[PDB]
Amino acid sequence: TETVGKFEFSRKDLIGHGAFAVVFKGRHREKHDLEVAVKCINKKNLAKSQTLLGKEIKILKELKHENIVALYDFQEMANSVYLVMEYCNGGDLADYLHAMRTLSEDTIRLFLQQIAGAMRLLHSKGIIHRDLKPQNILLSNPANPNSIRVKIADFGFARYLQSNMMAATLCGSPMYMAPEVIMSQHYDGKADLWSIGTIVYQCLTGKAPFQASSPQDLRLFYEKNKTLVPTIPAATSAPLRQLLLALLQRNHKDRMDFDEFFHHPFLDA
Ligand SMILES: CN1CCc2cc(Nc3ncc(C4CC4)c(NCCCNC(=O)C4CCC4)n3)ccc2C1
Ligand SMILES: [Mg+2]
Ligand SMILES: [Mg+2]
């Protein structure tokens, strides 16, 4: 049992892992019923891990929203870093999709209204996420899809981007990366909107809109196809079809912008 400020966890309660972090379930030391997720260094990549966790602290401490996983505390030292975060008792969207296979438009709408709420704050703060994918959308059950709360997690690749500048760091997960990102071009806040479009498509159909055998194949696919249109099922409602076609535009200049996304008719209650 390791401790971190007012919190503790055991390395036996692994709930998540990637190349640059490991996450354990834990609790408050006084209030045993307050569950937390404690994110730690992955020693296999010590230096990069330490750098990313440090950056994630800087971003997350500026974001307080019901649809963004909360940072309760953290601890940074020369040779160790910990983030103490909100525990999401529903697991991730990837697992939920594995079980449901596909989601109804009504569930998709509920989830996307919430994601949109978070992105509104990110966009207003000038922050881009750069690793949106089902594994980083988490579910919280306070029961049915109407009560599920969705929270964006994992801000380790996130950055401030000034509104007149472009980013160029190659990061994220290729299946969710905007074309401009995977083709090593400059990109902006609209790269996340492509990722969101891909997540929505995957919820609807159970697959990626543009599949390939490898990252390189996917890249070459995007390179060769200047006109690119996703296959949308015939049964899809008209507003959902419109939203997907507008998000999954290859060329970022043409792609739906934030204001269009936030006010899109598919999101109306
Ligand atoms: C099998 N399933 C695995 C995933 C999972 C996660 C949770 N609850 C959870 N709540 C919050 C968090 C976030 C704030 C730190 C969390 N994190 C792991 C899942 C999301 N991925 C990551 O954070 C990256 C993995 C390297 C960082 N996981 C509960 C059950 C399950 C069960
Ligand atoms: Mg990130
Ligand atoms: Mg862009």
GROMACS .gro file of C-alpha atoms in nm, residues 14 64 87 90 114 169 173-174 262:
model
    9
   14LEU     CA    1  -0.440  -0.204  -1.204
   64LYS     CA    2  -1.301   2.176  -1.410
   87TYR     CA    3  -1.261   0.720  -1.054
   90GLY     CA    4  -1.835   0.243  -1.564
  114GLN     CA    5  -2.158   1.551  -2.310
  169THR     CA    6   0.384   1.700  -3.320
  173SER     CA    7  -0.364   0.667  -3.219
  174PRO     CA    8  -0.354   0.625  -3.601
  262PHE     CA    9  -2.172   2.268  -3.079
   0.00000   0.00000   0.00000
